[PDB]
């Protein structure tokens, strides 16, 4: 049985506690925390693409009040986000579960650019999520898992310093 879970999930959860913000910028800007994921029960001689996209958790705008983040009352529908492929794909189920899969490099942006940067929805909440993809086999077989403890609000700037504080002490 393939199973994923979240590698440091102590940690992300103390950023969850305060409601987690990843910073967005024109050119893109790399998470942190980064997501790295622990994969078992994959065939280590098929081959597989990491790929990862963000769900829109809700469909409001969040904005900071008063110290606390809170829902507008005009919610819209959200386009979902783009895919980022981990670049060491595509590659062999023991090359993944060789070590925690990091998805160190992706870049957020507030704005549609180039390539590998993903776009998000200014002041909208996200759960990452991943698409494990066989491939070059007969049968292509996609398994998805989501990690709730990873939410953030996308954000130009830290509204909350105390999570401006957890980024600087664990960084
Ligand atoms: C996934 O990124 C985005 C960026 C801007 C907008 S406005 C809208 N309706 N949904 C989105 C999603």
Redesign the pocket.
């Known amino acids: 049985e393939l199973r994923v879970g979240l590698e440091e999930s102590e940690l992300w959860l103390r950023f969850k506690e305060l409601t987690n913000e990843m910073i967005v910028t024109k050119n893109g800007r790399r998470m942190f925390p980064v997501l790295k994921v622990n994969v078992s029960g994959l065939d280590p001689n098929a081959m597989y693409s990491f790929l990862l996209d963000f769900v829109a958790a809700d469909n409001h705008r969040w904005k900071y009040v008063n110290g606390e983040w809170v829902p507008g009352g005009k919610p819209?529908?959200?386009?979902?986000?783009c895919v980022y492929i981990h670049p060491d794909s595509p590659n062999f189920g023991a090359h993944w579960m060789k070590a925690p899969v990091s998805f160190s490099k992706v870049k957020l942006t507030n704005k549609l650019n180039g390539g590998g940067q993903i776009?998000?929805?200014s002041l909208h909440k996200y759960e990452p999520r991943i698409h494990i993809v066989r491939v070059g086999g007969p049968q292509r077989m996609i398994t998805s898992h989501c990690f709730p403890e990873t939410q953030f609000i996308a954000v130009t700037a830290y509204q909350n310093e105390e999570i401006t504080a957890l980024k600087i002490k664990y960084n």
């Open positions: 819209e529908p959200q386009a979902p986000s776009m998000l929805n």
